[PDB]
């Protein structure tokens, strides 16, 4: 199956600008209406997330067939300093007060 | 004219609409004399006509009991006859006539007017019916 | 009163460790 890099870069950017991704993804079908425009197979995202957990930077919760992630300062800093995406983009996990 | 006595046997849907005239009961378009079952006729016609034919000319009653089943509208028609007569003679004649007509309608029927709450009973799991199970243990 | 040995004994009053638990409970 296809292994790109810029699709994952876009997924990382949307994760940083949101905190959680909102796109139902099915391994069996290449495209789902929510999956579309972010065409990376579910398997890619959850395998990368399992590798991330084996490394460890982000927080998570699970409920009724659904993930609920939480991006803290560690994940913000890591996505900031690895992909050399400058801090001109402000995270969406600290909005308001 | 309001008497508020009705006639209701089992679950049949009935109407007792009262306004002066002859006492007639319409069943599937068949009046009281010529009845739908065509086999329980005497048991319903005996009490009224042997005493008088103008006896029902007091207050006409629309009795249109859409009853299905012969035990349903049969004896419901006589329930309606007795109840309408007793209520009319109760509210609109006097107390002594009330007493005597109630006596004759009670020697007509001692105590069987109103029943207990019961019908066909529910089914339980583990068997084909209400009180029955699967293969036997002798 | 120590409760750990009491629970260990109450789980099995005649087990492999019954004698030691009962002895520890005595004193």
């Amino acid at each position: 199956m296809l292994m790109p890099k810029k699709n994952r870069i876009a997924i990382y950017e949307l994760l940083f600008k949101e905190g959680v991704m909102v796109a139902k993804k099915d391994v069996h079908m290449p495209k789902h209406p929510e999956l579309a425009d972010k065409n990376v197979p579910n398997l890619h995202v959850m395998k990368a997330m399992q590798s991330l957990k084996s490394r460890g930077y982000v927080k998570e919760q699970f409920a009724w067939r659904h993930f609920y992630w939480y991006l803290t300062n560690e994940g913000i800093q890591y996505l900031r300093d690895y992909l050399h995406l400058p801090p001109e983009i402000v995270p969406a996990t600290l909005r308001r007060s | 004219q309001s008497v508020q006595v009705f006639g209701r046997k089992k679950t049949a849907t009935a109407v007792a609409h009262c306004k002066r005239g002859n006492g007639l009961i319409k069943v599937n378009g068949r009046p009281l004399e010529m009845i739908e079952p065509r086999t329980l006729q005497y048991k319903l016609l005996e009490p009224v006509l042997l005493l008088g034919k103008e006896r029902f000319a007091g207050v006409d009653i629309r009795v249109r009991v859409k009853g299905g089943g012969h035990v349903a509208q049969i004896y419901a028609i006589r329930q309606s006859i007795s109840k309408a007569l007793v209520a009319y003679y109760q509210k609109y004649v006097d107390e002594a006539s009330k007493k005597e007509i109630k006596d004759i309608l009670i020697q007509y029927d001692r105590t069987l007017l109103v029943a207990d709450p019961r019908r066909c009973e529910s089914k339980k799991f583990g068997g084909p019916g209400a009180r029955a199970r699967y293969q036997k243990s002798y | 009163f120590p409760y750990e040995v009491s629970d260990a004994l109450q789980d099995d009053p005649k087990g492999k460790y019954s004698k030691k638990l009962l002895n520890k409970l005595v004193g």
Binding site: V20, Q61, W64 | - | Y3, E4, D7, A8
Partner: protein
Amino acid sequence: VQISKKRKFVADGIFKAELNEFLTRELAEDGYSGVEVRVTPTRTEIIILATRTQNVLGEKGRRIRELTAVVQKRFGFPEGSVELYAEKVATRGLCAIAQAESLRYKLLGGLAVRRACYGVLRFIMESGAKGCEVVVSGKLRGQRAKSMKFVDGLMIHSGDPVNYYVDTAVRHVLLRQGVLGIKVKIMLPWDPTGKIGPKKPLPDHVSIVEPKDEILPTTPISEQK
């Protein structure tokens, strides 16, 4: 588009089940007791009932805000159409879920089973309940599993007045040996919100309310003003 009435009732039930399970899994470290939900036109308000408020709101109201997101992004509400607040339940020992969570937490900290159970039973007795029984089932000592329970006070096991007079909670605690199950059952007093006192008549159980008897004056002559 719009759906049928029975389907809307089933859907709100499944949403409530989703929410309760989610907030039990997520808010398992604060001490989770329950939830209330209220509805007004396009405004749905959810309240998480827990024993610790200063701990559940979080720093600068972070978690309480964050929860909104994980509701909004999941339940499919329109943007900014979900509000949620936080108040503290008046009592703690009368909620079976709360005491089950407390026992689970105590067994999570390594505190021994019997002393933890004794503590929770004593709390419930001091809480005002006229009966509690807790059961810890599974492996406590050894390879085989023991079901160990303590009961004190009163506890009805049958009839209808076990839904509105007994609170029951079942929870699981993991261990290097396995899983321990905690069942907490609590009796409730007669009048609502933990026996405040007699109010407008809503009788639910047998009681003999004996008032003070009339007293006559001893002096032969009556009162003079």
